C-alpha cells in the first residue's frame, strides 16, 4: 500500500499507453457502490475522455464515468449508460461522487458537493469482482485495448470507493474532506501499478 494523500496522478500527454491500474481487495461481486473522485482537466471543452473505467472479463465498461463533449457527464454500469447533462462547464478541479444500487437501480451523481437528479439504471445487476480498474484510459477489453482519443489528459486523485451507496450526509463529509474510511478502495492505502509516462505529483486542489 501507499499513502497517496495530497498527491495525484498527472497525465500530461494524450496516449493509449499512459494509465494506472488500481488493485481492489474485492471478493464478493458488488450489489452497490460509491466512487468519489477529484480531477482537473481542460479536455471537457474539446473531446470526450475517460474519468473512471471499471471493466471485467465478461463486460468491459462495467462501471464507467465519462465526459461527452456536447452533453456532459455520463455514467455506465453493466454496459448501459445514463447521461447527466451539464451543458455549461468551467475549468477547475471537479470533485464528483457516483453511487448506484442494485436493489433500486437508483443512480446518484454528485458534482462539487451537490447532487444531480437521482436517476435509474441497471436495477438488479451484479458487478463482477474480477475488476480491472484503470485511471487515465477507457478499456475496450479487460486491462487493455485503450483508445488514445478517450484517454484523460490532466490530473486525478482522491479516488475512493465503497461497497455501498453513501448518504448525502456522508457525501458531504467526504466533499468537505473530513475523516472517512472507504472499505473497497482507499486512497491512503492504495495498491496500484503505473505504466507509461505517468507521474505522481502534489495535488492542485485544496
Amino acid at each position: 500500500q501507499t499513502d497517496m494523500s495530497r498527491k495525484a496522478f498527472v497525465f500530461p500527454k494524450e496516449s493509449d499507453t499512459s494509465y494506472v491500474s488500481l488493485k481492489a481487495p474485492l471478493t464478493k461481486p458488488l450489489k452497490a457502490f460509491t466512487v468519489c473522485l477529484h480531477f482537473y482537466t481542460e479536455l471537457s471543452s474539446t473531446r470526450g475522455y475517460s474519468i473512471f473505467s471499471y471493466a471485467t472479463k465478461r463486460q468491459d465498461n462495467e462501471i464507467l464515468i465519462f465526459w461527452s463533449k456536447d452533453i456532459g457527464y455520463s455514467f455506465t454500469v453493466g454496459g448501459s449508460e445514463i447521461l447527466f447533462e451539464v451543458p455549461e462547464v468551467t475549468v477547475a478541479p471537479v470533485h464528483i461522487c457516483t453511487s448506484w444500487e442494485s436493489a433500486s437501480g437508483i443512480v446518484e451523481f454528485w458534482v462539487d458537493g451537490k447532487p444531480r437528479v437521482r436517476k435509474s439504471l441497471k436495477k438488479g445487476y451484479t458487478v463482477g469482482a474480477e475488476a480491472s480498474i484503470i485511471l487515465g484510459q477507457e478499456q475496450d477489453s479487460f486491462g487493455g485495448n485503450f483508445e488514445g482519443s478517450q484517454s484523460l489528459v490532466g490530473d486525478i486523485g482522491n479516488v475512493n470507493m465503497w461497497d455501498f451507496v453513501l448518504s448525502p450526509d456522508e457525501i458531504n463529509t467526504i466533499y468537505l474532506g473530513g475523516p472517512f474510511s472507504p472499505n473497497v478502495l482507499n486512497w491512503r492505502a492504495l495498491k496500484y501499478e503505473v505504466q507509461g509516462e505517468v507521474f505522481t505529483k502534489p495535488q492542485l486542489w485544496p
Partner: antibody
Amino acid sequence: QVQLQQSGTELSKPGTGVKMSCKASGYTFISYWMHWVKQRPGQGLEWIGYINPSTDSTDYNQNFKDKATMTVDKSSTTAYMQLSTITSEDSAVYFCARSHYLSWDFDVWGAGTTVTV
Amino acid sequence: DIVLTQSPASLAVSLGQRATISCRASQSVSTSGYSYIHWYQQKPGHPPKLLIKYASNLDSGVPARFSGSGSGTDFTLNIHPVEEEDAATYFCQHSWELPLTFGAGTKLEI
C-alpha cells in the same frame, strides 16, 4: 436508549459451534456497521471483523476468516457471530460494538458474551 | 497490518497527578491533518468506553482531564489531574485500514 444487548454466557465443548447475538436497540440499525471484537481474559483486544447490515457484507481479521461468520437480521435488528469448531483457545469475552459506517471508532458497545470452551 | 505498540504496560499514579500513556504506530496514520487513532477506557467487568477519537477529539460525556495528542507514528493520552475514577485499562486503536488493530493496552493503577 441506544444500546447493544448480547445473549449472555455460552458454555460449550471442543468441536462444537456457538452463535451469539447482539440486539441493537434505539437507533436505525441500517445506518451503522456492527463490529465484533475478542478479548481473552486479562489480555488485550482482538478485532474479529465487521458486518454492514445495509449490504449484508462482511470482512474479517485474517485470523478469523474461517473461525467466524457474521450475519444480521434487519427485521429484528439483531447481529450475530457464529464460531466454528471452537476450541479452548477460543475462550474469551466477545463484544459487539457500533460504528458510524464511514468512521471506525467503536461508539457504543455491548456488555460482552463470555464463551468458556 | 498496522502494529500499535503501547507503553508502559502499567502505570502507577497518585491521585491529582498526570498519567501519560503512549502508543506507537508502525506507520504514519495521519493524513490531511486528521489522524486515525482512538483511545478507549475499559474498567474490569465492563466493556470499553471510547475516550478520544482521531488522536485528540474528546468524546461527549468525557471529562476535560482526558486529553489525547500526537501525530504521525507517535500518540499519547494524558489524564490530568489523574483521579480515582481513572483506575482502568487503556487501549489505542487505529481506523486507517482493515484489519483494525488494538494496542496491547496499559493498566493505570493508583
